[PDB]
């Protein structure tokens, strides 16, 4: 066992492993069966086991085999071990965390000795087949039972079953699992996550009679118009055969019983030598077959009994079945006839406390954020998931991508294993065992064939393998240039929009343009889009707008839900997220496990919001006062479904009212809005229309808001001119200072910077920092990349910054005066920013401060055309109150961006201080709100047509921090007022992706404020 | 081990230790003679006689035999089937099986041909290069010793299989 | 696959070969048993996988085949493209399953005859004039075995080449076969004869069928 490293051998995946099959529970009862109750032939082992951690296998005690370790403890399981903090979690991304030299792995090579001491009662051992179930373990295993050695398993994501009939006593027995972290399995598990191990899924017994259903495929075919289907069932048995045996095949909708056969064991012909006696397929007529999607998820109970002829019931297995057909056709990807327009996510099996052990209520929660945010597809990214993921998903309703365990993005090249004959066979197994477990969910609509591992003949064998044995769902893979011979579905990932990528062997094109390659006829579904990390989702509407003009451009899937955050606790215990090298491991890849729409505990960032917005499911459209409402609902009416509808003038509402929704799928409702009085003052009317869903249903609650838009309606320009003011201010001029005094207040321009370094309202002071430009932003993740200090990437936004002088520029002053005016002061600045003898930036301005006690501030900046665009172009300030709540008229309520705002709707806004502040883990520019006309904190209002951020943090202390947790809110508040800010990309997150039209690029660029107290 | 592990009734395993497949080779280290085709010292032919016994099961083959000839071996041609040497009976059948259908396993009773070969080896094939023997075919399955230590396993009768010597070989007789 | 000096002669002397993986598993039942199992996919790829890695440069080598009588299952399915992708300079055929499957490039039955149907059920073997012109049938015709000459036998041979002349998808077939399989034994007196099955004790066995 020591000698034979099984461990190191891709020629060995197994030994004494049972057949791979779909869920089995082997009731004894059929009402039990047809109910999915509980079943008592299945044990749960669900509980605390005796574990003891190794070096290398080579130190385990040979003890620990007849005996228990004193030294072990008792920790829960399914577990990580690396949770309970006996070694340490790696996170890398492509690079393997071990060296590349297959099969084999480091001689020290942590071992986790599991145990337990459990009871069986004697009538499982009378008669029939105990087996032990192992769902997860990572990442292979030798198992013994009473001292004596059963097998030995690999492929951390798929159930491992073994035969312990002939191991157990009747009383007390001993489990001996010993588990490797790595093996040569770990050649084929190169995902971009958290490298863990362990026993990390359920272990379970089920006890099965000697003669039984050994597995069971559950087919649906369709007529033309869906009105008729046949459910046909292949059933097969082991034990021996005799002729008393029958098999009833049940088909239930709810407690109705709708069709039912029975047939005894011998199939058709099938060769010359015969047919499987051992297998019978029953076929039963369904006339009106109420059909699953993600729209409605309608399913039935299939209950498959075991039985004599005479009616004795021997075992009986079940599953929920969907009427659904997937196929592709002239190009398009159809379900039940009609082209799917996939709202997709990837989604790794993360908990933040549990590692990769996934559990029942954070499936839910996640099923029913993505479901509340428009989203309708999820891709198992990068294995077979969780086996109640599957059932939640069917009954739920979502679209599944089911991809096998494979991913070798570290090798060199990609397809070093998949394109090697001798790796096809561990390669098969990770395939061919997914499809005999996964192929009767109904939520499963695409077969994936692993990720990033290149393109192999390996590929073209198991693609042919599915396309055989399962012709009912098409086969997707991405590697090797996302549209080879290996794949059903141009599957790309980071494709952008508009912009071809042609890296040699393996382009990236246009989206659109790849649809139109010559010869090219197949659908295009993104398997990975509009990389969330960070500060992210930039050009996210780009995608679908693209989505909805192309008929064959049919979605994505996002990378990805949740960001791989784990807790760590500080020395005060206090929890905090940590990434990438925060446990000692290295290499690492840092920040790049955060990427997900939500944190690690499930709550939303900004992106959220942009998503469910693009993906609403109704589109609208404004002609004159007629609404027109269309739905992209292919199989549902909207009956669930009222539209409100608000016209406001500058937030201030003037009229409202409801109207129900009553839009067939794919169709057309006109709302004429009734005449709307006139407004008397000045400003822009804006419509905003939200659709409100009345009812709870099983994945949202009571009033639920699922799609929104807004337009601007009649605009009255403001041509009064304001109150003529009687007071007039006055110039006070010394050899540092121009001051200008007006009541209580008074303004202060320091002559030798030229920014105004002070205010009073009062005796008080307004301000902590002056008031000085600001042409850079604290980096996103996007501006950043792949970069580090000991490797620069030249080509990331933040070192181009960097190496121009963006953030050391220092700001000359060219010229300073100041004009007494009839009724004002005027202030004239120029500035010039130079790096090395080059002028960056210059910035020419004015300041009018009138009788009314108003400050209006005039900026014109010029960038030079041969500097990298700047990040932004505006203000920043340390103010000295620290005020409870911001009210602004603008975009929000959350975190917007040029390129991320569509979701964002023009109204009056109140926030406390915090929510205009974005926890991102890994610190950033960030909370910035755009089309803002006026702003308001503590006693100053601002006002123009400008984007603004506003907290406790300066954009110096953000870009110097790594970890949100090491942050310290500052004196006062830091306020950036920005004329314009770049957008923040995220097509990607390793290469530029901010697009031309969000850079800024202009050359010359103007605004104003005017700054005032209410 | 080896008794322990009964690799020829897994098709799990279907070789250990087996080098890559490939093209015919001969390892020239003159242009002329790959050119010409003519014989290359670098390739050698084993086929001699060699030490043969049989047995009716591998339980019944002795330890012994894996450091030293057993004496009541004969000395044979090779390459040979040994039913045409007559240690047990050639067998013709058309479909059915010549074993009990019941995957993976075969008969308890298995003949098993102990085959061995003493031998020398050049001195600057020990001092530098890549030393493997190739078996063109065995008929069904095999494992392999070279100087008592175990090698590895193969299967398919038709195919070549190929062991790398290189770390078992010693000065003199092997 | 056959002894390596075999492809060696046929490419200096002059004849196409079909080289074959050493599959065959015409006693299971049904004859697809092991080939469907995906469990004995690791076993079948070798077979077919390490042939091809031997004998890909042999110019003789025109046809790669991917054994005999094992029915039709997945896995020749998916080592008939695993070929496809490795060397696209050959076709690929394979008889199991009714000659025509998903896992050939030629129609190749065994013993099919030129005029008369034989409509076994799941595997008929149709006259092969019918065959080529099945609905939706476009592939070339080549029996893998046809003409079994045990014994008198070869009657009706004729029958074949006229038909194999007028129709030009019938690109002909491959006789079964060469030599018998009989052993040398020898009489009391020292004398040889020639020996079939059942000549060696052997039991259950086949009798004159090796040759
Ligand atoms: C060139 C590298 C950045 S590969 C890039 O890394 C990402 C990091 O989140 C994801 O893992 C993507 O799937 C992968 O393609
Ligand atoms: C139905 C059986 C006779 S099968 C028949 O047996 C023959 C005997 O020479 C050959 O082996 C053929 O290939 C085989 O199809
Ligand atoms: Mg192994
Ligand atoms: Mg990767
Ligand atoms: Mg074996
Ligand atoms: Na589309
Ligand atoms: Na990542
Ligand atoms: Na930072
Ligand atoms: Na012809
Ligand atoms: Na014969």
């Given at each position: 066992?020591?000698?034979?490293?099984?461990?190191?051998?891709?020629?060995?995946?197994?030994?004494?492993?049972?057949?791979?099959?779909p869920?089995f529970?082997?009731?004894?009862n059929?009402?039990?069966?047809?109910?999915?109750?509980?079943?008592?032939?299945l044990?749960?082992?669900?509980?605390?086991?005796?574990?003891?951690?190794?070096?290398?296998?080579?130190?385990?005690?040979?003890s620990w085999?007849?005996?228990?370790?004193?030294?072990?403890?008792?920790?829960?399981?399914?577990?990580?071990?690396?949770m309970?903090?006996?070694?340490?979690?790696?996170?890398?991304?492509?690079?393997?965390?071990?060296?590349?030299?297959?099969?084999?792995?480091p001689?020290?090579?942590?071992?986790?000795?599991?145990?337990?001491?459990?009871?069986?009662?004697e009538?499982?051992?009378?008669?029939?087949?105990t087996?032990?179930?192992?769902?997860?373990v990572?990442?292979?295993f030798?198992?013994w039972?009473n001292?004596?050695?059963?097998?030995?398993?690999?492929?951390?994501r798929?159930?491992?079953?073994?035969?312990?009939?002939?191991?157990?006593?009747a009383?007390?027995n001993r489990?001996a699992?010993?588990?490797?972290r790595?093996?040569?399995?770990?050649y084929?598990?190169?995902?971009?996550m958290?490298?863990?191990?362990?026993?990390?899924?359920?272990?379970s017994?089920?006890?099965?009679?000697?003669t039984?259903?050994?597995?069971?495929?559950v087919?649906?075919?369709?007529?033309?118009?869906?009105?008729?289907?046949?459910?046909?069932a292949?059933?097969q048995m082991?034990?021996?055969?005799r002729?008393?045996?029958?098999?009833?095949?049940?088909?239930?909708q709810?407690?109705?019983q709708?069709?039912?056969?029975?047939?005894?064991?011998?199939?058709?012909?099938?060769?010359?030598?015969?047919?499987?006696?051992?297998?019978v397929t029953?076929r039963?007529?369904?006339?009106?077959?109420?059909?699953?999607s993600?729209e409605?998820?309608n399913?039935?109970?299939?209950?498959?009994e075991?039985?004599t002829?005479?009616?004795t019931?021997?075992?009986?297995?079940?599953?929920?079945?969907?009427?659904?057909?997937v196929?592709?056709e002239?190009?398009?990807?159809?379900?039940?006839?009609?082209?799917?327009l996939?709202?997709?996510?990837?989604r790794?099996?993360?908990?933040?406390?549990?590692?990769?052990?996934?559990?029942?209520?954070?499936?839910?929660?996640?099923?029913?954020?993505?479901?509340?945010?428009?989203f309708?597809?999820?891709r198992?990214?990068?294995?077979?998931?969780?086996?109640?993921?599957?059932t939640?998903?069917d009954?739920?309703?979502?679209?599944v991508?089911?991809?096998?365990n494979?991913?070798?993005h570290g090798?060199?090249?990609?397809?070093?294993l998949?394109?090697?004959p001798?790796?096809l066979?561990?390669?098969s197994?990770?395939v061919?065992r997914?499809?005999?477990?996964?192929?009767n969910?109904?939520?499963?609509?695409?077969?994936?064939?692993?990720?990033?591992?290149?393109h192999?003949?390996?590929?073209?064998?198991?693609?042919?393998?599915?396309k055989?044995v399962?012709?009912?769902?098409?086969?997707?893979?991405?590697?090797?240039?996302a549209?080879?011979?290996?794949?059903?579905?141009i599957?790309?990932?980071?494709?952008?929009?508009?912009?071809?990528?042609?890296?040699?062997?393996?382009?990236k094109?246009?989206?659109k343009?790849?649809?139109?390659?010559?010869?090219?006829?197949?659908?295009?579904?993104?398997?990975?889009?509009?990389?969330?990390?960070?500060?992210?989702l930039?050009?996210?509407?780009?995608?679908?707008?693209?989505?909805?003009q192309?008929?064959?451009?049919?979605?994505?899937?996002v990378?990805?839900?949740?960001?791989?955050?784990?807790i760590?606790?500080?020395?005060?215990?206090?929890?905090?997220?940590?990434?990438?090298?925060d446990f000692?491991?290295?290499?690492?890849?840092?920040?790049?496990?955060?990427?997900?729409?939500?944190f690690?505990?499930r709550?939303?960032?900004?992106?959220?919001?942009?998503?469910?917005?693009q993906?609403?499911?109704?589109?609208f459209?404004l002609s004159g006062?007629?609404?027109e409402?269309?739905?992209e609902?292919?199989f549902?009416h909207?009956?669930?479904?009222?539209?409100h509808?608000?016209?406001?003038?500058?937030?201030?509402?003037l009229?409202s009212?409801?109207?129900?929704?009553?839009?067939?799928?794919?169709?057309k409702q006109?709302?004429?809005?009734?005449?709307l009085?006139?407004?008397?003052?000045?400003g822009?009317?804006?419509l905003?229309?939200?659709?409100?869903?009345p009812?709870?249903t099983?994945?949202?609650?009571?009033?639920?808001?699922?799609?929104?838009?807004?337009?601007r309606?009649?605009?009255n320009?403001?041509?009064?001119?304001?109150?003529?003011?009687?007071?007039?201010?006055?110039?006070?001029?010394?050899?540092?200072?121009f001051?200008?005094?007006?009541?209580?207040?008074?303004?202060?321009?320091?002559?030798?910077?030229?920014?105004?370094?002070?205010?009073?309202?009062?005796?008080?002071?307004?301000l902590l920092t002056?008031?000085?430009?600001?042409?850079?932003r604290?980096?996103?993740?996007?501006?950043?990349?792949?970069?580090?200090?000991?490797?620069?990437?030249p080509?990331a936004?933040?070192?181009?910054?960097?190496?121009?002088?963006?953030?050391?520029?220092?700001?000359?002053?060219?010229?300073?005066?100041?004009?007494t005016?009839?009724?004002?002061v005027?202030?004239?600045?120029?500035?010039?920013?130079?790096?090395?003898?080059?002028?960056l930036?210059?910035?020419?301005?004015?300041?009018?401060?009138?009788?009314?006690?108003?400050?209006?501030?005039?900026?014109?900046?010029?960038?030079?055309?041969?500097?990298?665009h700047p990040?932004?172009?505006?203000?920043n300030c340390?103010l000295?109150?620290?005020?409870?709540?911001?009210?602004?008229?603008?975009?929000?309520?959350?975190?917007?961006?040029?390129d991320?705002?569509?979701?964002?709707?023009?109204?009056?806004?109140?926030?406390?201080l915090?929510?205009?502040?974005?926890?991102?883990?890994?610190?950033?520019?960030?909370?910035?709100?755009?089309?803002t006309?006026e702003?308001?904190?503590?006693?100053?209002?601002?006002?123009?047509?400008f984007?603004?951020?506003?907290?406790?943090?300066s954009?110096?202390?953000?870009?110097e921090?790594?970890?949100?947790?090491?942050?310290?809110?500052?004196?006062?508040?830091?306020?950036?007022i920005?004329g314009?800010?770049?957008?923040?990309?995220?097509?990607?997150?390793?290469?530029?992706?901010?697009?031309?039209?969000?850079?800024?690029?202009?050359?010359?660029?103007?605004?104003?404020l005017?700054?005032?107290?209410? | 081990?080896?008794?322990?592990?009964?690799d020829?009734?897994?098709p799990?395993?279907?070789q250990?230790n087996?080098?890559?497949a490939?093209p015919?080779?001969?390892?020239?280290?003159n242009?002329?003679?790959?050119?010409?085709?003519?014989?290359?010292?670098?390739?050698?032919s084993?086929?001699?006689?060699?030490?043969?016994?049989?047995?009716?099961?591998?339980?019944?083959?002795?330890?012994?035999?894996?450091?030293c000839?057993?004496?009541e071996?004969?000395?044979?041609v090779?390459?040979?089937?040994?039913?045409?040497?007559?240690?047990?009976?050639?067998?013709?059948?058309?479909?059915?099986?010549?074993?009990?259908?019941?995957?993976?396993?075969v008969p308890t009773?298995?003949?098993?041909?102990?085959?061995?070969?003493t031998?020398?080896?050049?001195?600057?094939?020990?001092q530098?290069?890549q030393?493997?023997?190739?078996?063109?075919?065995?008929?069904?399955?095999?494992?392999?010793?070279?100087?008592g230590?175990?090698?590895?396993?193969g299967?398919?009768s038709?195919?070549?299989?190929?062991?790398?010597?290189?770390?078992?070989?010693?000065?003199?007789?092997?």
């Open positions: 066992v020591l000698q034979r490293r099984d461990w190191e051998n891709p020629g060995v995946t197994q030994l004494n492993r049972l057949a791979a099959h869920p529970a082997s009731w004894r059929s009402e039990e069966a047809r109910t999915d109750r509980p079943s008592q032939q044990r749960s082992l669900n509980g605390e086991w005796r574990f003891a951690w190794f070096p290398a296998p080579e130190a385990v005690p040979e085999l007849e005996c228990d370790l004193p030294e072990a403890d008792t920790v829960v399981v399914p577990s990580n071990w690396q309970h903090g006996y070694d340490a979690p790696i996170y890398t991304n492509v690079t393997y965390p071990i060296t590349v030299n297959p099969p084999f792995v001689t020290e090579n942590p071992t986790g000795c599991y145990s337990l001491t459990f009871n069986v009662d009538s499982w051992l009378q008669e029939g087949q087996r032990i179930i192992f769902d997860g990572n990442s292979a030798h198992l039972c001292g004596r050695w059963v097998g030995y398993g690999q492929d951390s798929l159930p491992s079953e073994f035969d312990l009939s002939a191991f157990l006593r009383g007390e489990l699992v010993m588990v490797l790595w093996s040569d399995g770990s084929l598990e190169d995902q971009d958290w490298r863990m191990s362990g026993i990390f899924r359920d272990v017994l089920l006890h099965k009679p000697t039984q259903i050994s597995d069971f495929h087919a649906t075919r369709f007529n033309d118009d869906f009105s008729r289907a046949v459910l046909e292949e059933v082991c034990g021996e055969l002729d008393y045996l029958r098999v009833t095949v049940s088909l239930w709810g407690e109705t709708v069709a039912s056969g029975t047939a005894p064991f011998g199939g058709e012909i099938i060769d010359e030598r015969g047919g499987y006696a051992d297998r029953l039963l007529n369904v006339e009106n077959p109420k059909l699953w993600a409605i998820p399913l039935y109970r299939a209950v498959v075991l039985h002829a005479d009616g019931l021997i075992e009986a297995e079940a599953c929920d079945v969907g009427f659904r057909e196929r592709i002239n190009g398009l990807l159809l379900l039940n006839g009609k082209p799917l996939i709202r997709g996510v990837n790794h099996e993360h908990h933040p406390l549990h590692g990769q052990v996934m559990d029942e209520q954070t499936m839910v929660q996640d099923i029913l954020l993505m479901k509340q945010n428009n309708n597809a999820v198992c990214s990068h294995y077979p998931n969780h086996p109640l993921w599957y939640l998903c009954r739920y309703g979502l679209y991508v089911d991809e096998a494979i991913e070798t090798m060199v090249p990609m397809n070093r998949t394109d090697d001798r790796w066979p561990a390669m197994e990770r061919t997914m499809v005999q477990r996964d192929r969910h109904p939520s499963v609509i695409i077969w994936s064939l692993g990720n990033e591992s290149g192999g003949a390996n590929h073209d064998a198991l693609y042919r393998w599915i055989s399962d012709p009912s769902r098409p086969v997707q893979y991405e590697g090797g240039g549209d080879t011979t290996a794949t059903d579905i599957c790309p990932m980071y494709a952008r929009v508009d912009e071809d990528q042609p890296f040699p062997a393996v382009p094109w246009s989206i343009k790849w649809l139109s390659l010559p010869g090219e006829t197949r659908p295009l579904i993104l398997c990975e889009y509009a990389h969330a990390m960070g500060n992210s930039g050009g996210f509407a780009k995608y679908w707008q693209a989505f909805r192309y008929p064959r451009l049919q979605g994505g899937f990378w990805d839900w949740v960001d791989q955050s784990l760590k606790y500080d020395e005060n215990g206090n929890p905090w997220s940590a990434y990438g090298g000692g491991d290295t290499p690492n890849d840092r920040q790049f496990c955060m990427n997900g729409l939500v690690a505990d709550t939303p960032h900004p992106a959220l919001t942009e998503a469910k917005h993906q609403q499911f109704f589109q459209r006062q007629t609404i409402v269309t739905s609902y292919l549902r909207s009956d669930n479904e009222l539209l509808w608000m016209v406001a003038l500058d937030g201030k509402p009229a009212g409801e109207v129900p929704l009553d839009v067939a799928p794919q169709g006109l709302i004429e809005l009734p005449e009085p006139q407004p008397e003052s000045a822009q009317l804006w905003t229309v939200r659709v409100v869903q009812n709870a099983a994945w949202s609650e009571a009033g639920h808001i699922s799609a929104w838009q807004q337009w309606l009649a605009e320009l403001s041509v009064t001119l304001p109150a003529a003011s009687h007071a007039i201010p006055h110039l006070t001029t010394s050899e540092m200072d001051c200008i005094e007006l009541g209580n207040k008074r303004w202060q321009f320091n002559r030798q910077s030229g920014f105004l370094s002070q205010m009073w309202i009062g005796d008080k002071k307004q002056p008031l000085r430009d600001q042409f850079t604290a980096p996103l993740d996007n501006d950043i990349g792949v970069t580090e200090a000991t490797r620069i990437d080509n936004w933040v070192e181009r910054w960097k190496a121009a002088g963006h953030y050391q520029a220092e700001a000359a002053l060219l010229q300073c005066t100041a004009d005016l009839a009724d004002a005027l202030i004239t600045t120029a500035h010039a920013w130079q790096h090395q003898g080059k002028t930036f210059i910035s020419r301005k004015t300041y009018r401060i009138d009788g009314s006690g108003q400050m209006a501030i005039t900026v014109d900046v010029e960038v030079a055309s041969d500097t990298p990040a932004r172009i505006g203000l340390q000295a109150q620290v005020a409870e709540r911001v009210n602004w008229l603008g975009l929000g309520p959350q975190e917007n961006y040029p991320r705002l569509t979701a964002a709707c023009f109204d009056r806004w109140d926030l406390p915090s929510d205009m502040y974005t926890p991102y883990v890994f610190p950033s520019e960030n909370g910035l709100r755009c089309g006309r702003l308001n904190y503590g006693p100053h209002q601002w006002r123009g047509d984007q603004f951020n506003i907290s406790r943090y954009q110096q202390q953000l870009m921090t790594s970890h949100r947790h090491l942050l310290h809110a500052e004196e006062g508040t830091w306020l950036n920005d314009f800010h770049m957008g923040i990309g995220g097509d990607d997150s390793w290469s530029p992706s901010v697009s031309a039209e969000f850079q800024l690029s202009a050359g010359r660029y103007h605004y104003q005017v700054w005032c107290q209410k | 081990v080896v008794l322990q592990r009964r020829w009734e897994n799990g395993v279907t250990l087996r080098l890559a490939h015919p080779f001969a390892s020239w280290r242009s002329e003679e790959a050119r010409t085709d003519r014989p290359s010292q670098q390739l050698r084993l086929n001699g006689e060699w030490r043969f016994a049989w047995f009716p099961a591998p339980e019944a083959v002795p330890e012994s035999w894996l450091e000839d057993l004496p071996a004969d000395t044979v090779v390459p040979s089937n040994w039913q045409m040497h007559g240690y047990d009976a050639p067998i013709y059948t058309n479909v059915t099986y010549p074993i009990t259908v019941n995957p993976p396993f009773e298995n003949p098993t041909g102990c085959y061995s070969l031998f020398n080896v050049d001195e600057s094939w020990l530098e290069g030393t493997r023997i190739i078996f063109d075919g065995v008929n069904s399955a095999f494992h392999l010793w070279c100087n230590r175990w090698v590895g396993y299967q398919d038709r195919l070549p299989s190929e062991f790398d010597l290189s770390a078992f070989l010693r000065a003199g007789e092997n």
